[PDB]
Design a protein around this nucleic acid. Structure first.
Ligand code: MG
Ligand code: MG
Ligand code: MG
Ligand code: MG
Ligand code: MG
Ligand code: MG
Ligand code: MG
Ligand code: MG
Ligand code: MG
Ligand code: MG
Ligand code: MG
Ligand code: MG
Ligand code: MG
Ligand code: MG
Ligand code: MG
Ligand code: MG
Lengths: 55, 85, 95, 116, 109, 41, 101, 93, 115
RNA sequence: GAAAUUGAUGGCGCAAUAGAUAUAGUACCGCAAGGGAAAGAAAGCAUAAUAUAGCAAGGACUAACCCCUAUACCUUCUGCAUAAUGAAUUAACUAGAAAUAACUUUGCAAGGAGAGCCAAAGCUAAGACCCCCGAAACCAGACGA
RNA sequence: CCGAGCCUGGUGAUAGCUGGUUGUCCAAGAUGAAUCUUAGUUCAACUUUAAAUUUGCCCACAGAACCCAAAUCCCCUU
RNA sequence: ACCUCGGAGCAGAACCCAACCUCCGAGCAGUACAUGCUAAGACUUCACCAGUCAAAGCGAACCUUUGAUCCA
């Protein structure tokens, strides 16, 4: 349920996840549906990260 | 008559490398050069890749020989260094 | 099997499968080994031990059984003291 | 007859227009026309190889005639021109034989000279 | 008049060639009679199949063959050899790879 | 949002402009023609 | 290809040339130049100083539709394609020679 | 004068004969391959010298292959593509 | 049966007569092969087909440069009847980055840095 | 294959080979039972026979033919010009129906679904996928010496 | 048109058998086991699509039996 | 006459390989009564079914071929 600059969110997610993976994660930005899909399971890490960002 | 061309060191096929194919087919009447032909550009790219591969393979083999030389030197110097008492 | 029953129009279950196989929810099918109760007096102890075991099915065998049973048999069942409760799910499975 | 084809006339005509110059019922009856039109198109496709093959044979025949007029044989002419580094092709050589007989005479003399 | 003889092959032979990494319990070779003899860290089943008793690398060697004295036929065969003769056989060994454990610090009492 | 501004710029949304989401409607395969006809799979 | 050419001749090249129609060009690979009483032969190409062949892009067209038909009996194998090749008509304007022998 | 059965397959076949042209062709091929033997008889490096000299490049190439294989993923979807379909009813007022 | 053929090693041991005939010095041997496929892989065993594909000789009469090292030589020995091998000669040494785009492989087997 | 229990004038039809068999259960066929129609508002020829040679065309050509190239199609077969099958030809009609599980695209999301059902990211919705003709027969009830 | 009439119905009988199966275009795509079974089918192998991540083929040396040949298997490199 | 299983050759050297192919053998016995129970890891008759081997551990002691399901 992403609103606004989904591309800014994608950049932030890539920055946050590349150190964990060691490579820039592969992602799909559904700008229509407002979703960001990342290859691999990062649900817990992304939940913690979004909590820190205050969403 | 491709055998004679090969003996003279030319391409067996006159349509291979040579003036008749590598030179520009035309130019503007003013004298301005024509844009490079598609076939000539493709052939130049292929020759560049061929030269790059030649360089890469030569460098890899030379580096391998140097590394083997260094390994032999390290082995002999270390086995000599073991003589310390 | 019956893909469309004549009374409901539904897909039917092959009850011969239900009488023989256990489905673990994750998608695995467990079975007994054939002959595990037959002429045990002439089978070596190792063979008897192999025969007394509960055994998983192939991928294609599992697919066949899935086709032959309906979605009722492929649900989560929270039985009281199910001996297979722990086996109903897979863990640490990479691909 | 919920859905019926209404274009069959035009679909038939597309084939028949290519058969209109055939003999017999092949130019009228679609059943027969379509088979022959397919064969005609396949022949048209495969004939692009034979056109090139026959032109070179025609050029070689004409060059042979022209060179024999000057005592040369076609192999000698072609080989000696190559050895003299003249890269005229057979199409041009046949054109010269027909329309520039003095130039072809010059080339034949050149080939014989090189041969000697 | 010739019946039978339709039995299929037993698919026996070496399962792990030399240098292959082998975990404990892996069958190394199945044979009908003793083509290869068990070496170090290699066991023998009822049916004379060779399996690895440790986790390591499989090696094949040739070693002098001294049978168990209770193996009466082999002992007689040896008794009939000349003085210089020594029997040899092909043996399969597993060169164990990992150490059998390490000492770790658990508590700094 | 910029999407609503794009709408403001674009033609009116009507029943003549509607399209299913790409990838949601697979083409229907039916046994006519060379590749799907003859023995029809 | 090699074209036997003279002033005012028309030549049909089977490809687009990236030239505007009416644009003047110099044909640089001249293998032979000949007159009534003499001919000059390159080995294989004559020098630029000797001969100057000039042309003009008169037309840029597409060829008539060419049919490519593939058929194999008793295999349900039948394919049809129509291809049009680009073409350029060039008019040879003049052939000049110079006394550079 | 007919050959029984089908030609070139049976026990009795059409006698085939070797022309001087065929002999020359075979000899030409043989000469090419004798030269191949000579040029294959002089390795530049020994097997032990070549051991590992290309390991780095081979590993990087396989890393590239793995990256391409594991980067497969659906493409992005843009609001612009969806909304541009409204233009099918663009007119002149 | 038909099988892979093991070429005896003595086949690949050049003699002084061969050295004179072909003009290669066993000391300081050439570094790179130029290999061209001059024969079809059709009607040849699948292993020869695979070797050709590995060496990148799918197109006939297209020269390919390979290392003159024992493993490449083993593959080339497998498919030696389908290829022409000539040493790559470098009269001006290997091309520099400046003239990497101005090289040409002469039919003699020389890579000249001027074209 | 249950039950307890739950409780609930119109046409993205046909339009005279279609739609009813139907203008009619008539004509006609049958001893009888019984079967049961049709229809109303291009092909084929003629103008103008025919020319050496040949899957009838193609490459062409100044030129129709002459030249060169070219072993119909479908189906069934390891393999068909095959002297294996089918087809005179035109018109019209005449043959891929669907679940389980997937995948794709939406929605919502530890929940989904408009009760029931599923759920250890699932659930809901949609999209995609399963032909035509043909026996000799068997049985029931009539009709027939 | 009687080795068991004819008609209607069950009935769109059934057919592992024969025949047929209609737009365009591109792409990948070829030779074991059981079975009242060899005119069929199921599993395998092959094949197609999509997906995951990481080694795959080639491959020298070393290695693979006593009894009584061509080659093969295995894998560092490449 | 044969139909299942097994040994040898064809099929020489990993495995695998047919036949109305050339030969041979078996439908168990002897033994004991841990010839128990459990369990890593493997093999596998080209599928499945079925069939093999087995460390460690526990417990006594100190083994060398035929056939499913249902039904009783
Ligand atoms: Mg046997
Ligand atoms: Mg097809
Ligand atoms: Mg004959
Ligand atoms: Mg009820
Ligand atoms: Mg009607
Ligand atoms: Mg008419
Ligand atoms: Mg026929
Ligand atoms: Mg028939
Ligand atoms: Mg007929
Ligand atoms: Mg009477
Ligand atoms: Mg009668
Ligand atoms: Mg039927
Ligand atoms: Mg293809
Ligand atoms: Mg049976
Ligand atoms: Mg059958
Ligand atoms: Mg198996």
């Amino acid at each position: 349920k992403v609103e606004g600059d989904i591309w800014a969110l994608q950049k932030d997610v890539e920055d946050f996840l590349s150190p964990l993976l060691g490579k820039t994660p592969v992602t799909q930005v559904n700008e229509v549906t407002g979703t960001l899909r990342i290859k691999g399971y990062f649900d817990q890490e992304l939940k913690a990260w979004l909590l820190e960002k205050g969403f | 008559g491709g055998q004679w061309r090969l003996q003279q060191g030319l391409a067996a096929n006159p349509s291979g490398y040579g003036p008749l194919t590598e030179l520009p087919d035309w130019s503007y009447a003013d004298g301005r050069p024509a844009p490079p032909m598609k076939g000539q550009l493709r052939r130049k790219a292929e020759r560049e890749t061929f030269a790059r591969r030649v360089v890469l393979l030569s460098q890899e083999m030379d580096a391998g020989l140097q590394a083997w030389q260094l390994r032999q030197q390290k082995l002999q110097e270390e086995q000599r260094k073991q003589e310390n008492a | 099997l019956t893909y469309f029953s004549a009374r409901k129009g539904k897909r039917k279950t092959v009850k011969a499968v239900i009488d023989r196989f256990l489905r673990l929810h994750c998608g695995l099918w467990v079975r007994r080994k054939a002959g595990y109760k037959k002429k045990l007096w002439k089978k070596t102890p190792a063979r008897k031990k192999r025969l007394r075991e509960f055994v998983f099915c192939n991928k294609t065998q599992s697919k066949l059984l899935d086709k032959m049973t309906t979605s009722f048999w492929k649900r989560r069942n929270w039985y009281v003291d199910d001996p297979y409760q722990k086996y109903h799910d897979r863990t640490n499975l990479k691909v | 007859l919920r859905n019926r084809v209404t274009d069959r006339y035009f679909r038939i005509q597309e084939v028949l227009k290519h058969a209109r110059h055939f003999r017999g019922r092949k130019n009228r009856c679609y059943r027969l026309a379509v088979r022959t039109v397919i064969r005609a198109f396949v022949k048209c496709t495969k004939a692009r190889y034979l056109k090139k093959k026959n032109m070179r044979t025609l050029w070689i025949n004409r060059i042979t005639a022209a060179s024999q007029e000057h005592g040369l044989k076609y192999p000698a002419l072609i080989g000696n021109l190559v050895k003299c580094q003249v890269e005229l092709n057979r199409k041009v050589l046949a054109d010269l034989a027909i329309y520039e007989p003095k130039t072809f005479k010059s080339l034949a003399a050149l080939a014989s000279r090189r041969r000697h | 008049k010739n019946l039978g003889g339709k039995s299929s092959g037993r698919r026996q032979g070496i399962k792990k060639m030399e240098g292959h990494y082998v975990h404990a319990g892996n069958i190394i070779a199945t044979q009908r009679h003793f083509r290869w003899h068990p070496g170090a860290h290699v066991g023998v089943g009822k049916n004379k199949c060779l399996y690895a008793l440790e986790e390591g690398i499989v090696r094949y060697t040739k070693e002098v063959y001294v049978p168990h004295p209770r193996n009466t036929e082999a002992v007689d065969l040896i008794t009939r050899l000349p003085k210089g003769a020594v029997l040899y056989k092909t043996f399969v060994h597993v060169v164990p790879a990992k150490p059998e454990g390490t000492f770790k610090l658990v508590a700094m009492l | 949002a910029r999407a609503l501004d794009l709408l403001r710029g674009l033609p009116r949304v009507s029943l003549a402009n509607l399209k299913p989401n790409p990838g949601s409607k697979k083409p229907e395969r039916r046994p006519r023609g060379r590749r799907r006809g003859r023995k029809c799979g | 290809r090699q074209w036997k050419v003279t002033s005012e001749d028309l030549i049909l090249i089977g490809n687009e040339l990236d030239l505007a129609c009416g644009e003047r060009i110099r044909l640089e690979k001249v293998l032979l130049v000949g007159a009534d009483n003499f001919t000059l032969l390159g080995k294989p190409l004559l020098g630029k100083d000797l001969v100057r062949v000039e042309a003009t892009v008169i037309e840029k067209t597409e060829s008539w539709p060419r049919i490519i038909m593939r058929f194999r009996k008793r295999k349900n194998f039948k394919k049809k394609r129509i291809v049009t090749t680009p073409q350029t008509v060039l008019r040879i304007n003049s052939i000049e020679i110079a006394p550079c022998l | 004068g007919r050959i029984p059965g089908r030609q070139w397959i049976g026990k009795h076949r059409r006698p085939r004969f070797v022309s001087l042209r065929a002999k020359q062709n075979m000899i030409r091929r043989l000469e090419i391959e004798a030269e191949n033997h000579y040029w294959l008889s002089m390795p530049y490096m020994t097997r032990e010298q070549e051991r590992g000299h290309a390991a780095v490049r081979r590993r990087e190439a396989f890393e590239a292959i793995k990256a391409a294989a594991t980067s497969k993923f659906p493409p992005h979807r843009f609001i612009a593509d969806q909304l541009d379909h409204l233009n099918v009813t663009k007119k002149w007022s | 049966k038909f099988t892979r053929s093991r070429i005896p090693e003595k086949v690949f041991q050049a003699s002084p007569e061969d050295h004179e005939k072909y003009g290669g010095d066993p000391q300081n041997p050439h570094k790179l092969h130029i290999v061209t496929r001059i024969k079809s892989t059709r009607r040849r065993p699948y292993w020869e087909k695979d070797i050709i594909k590995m060496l990148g000789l799918e197109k006939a009469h297209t020269p390919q440069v390979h290392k003159n090292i024992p493993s490449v030589n083993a593959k080339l020995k497998v498919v030696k009847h389908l290829i022409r091998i000539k040493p790559l000669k470098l009269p001006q040494g290997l091309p520099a980055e400046e003239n990497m785009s101005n090289t040409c492989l002469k039919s003699t087997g020389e890579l000249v840095v001027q074209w």
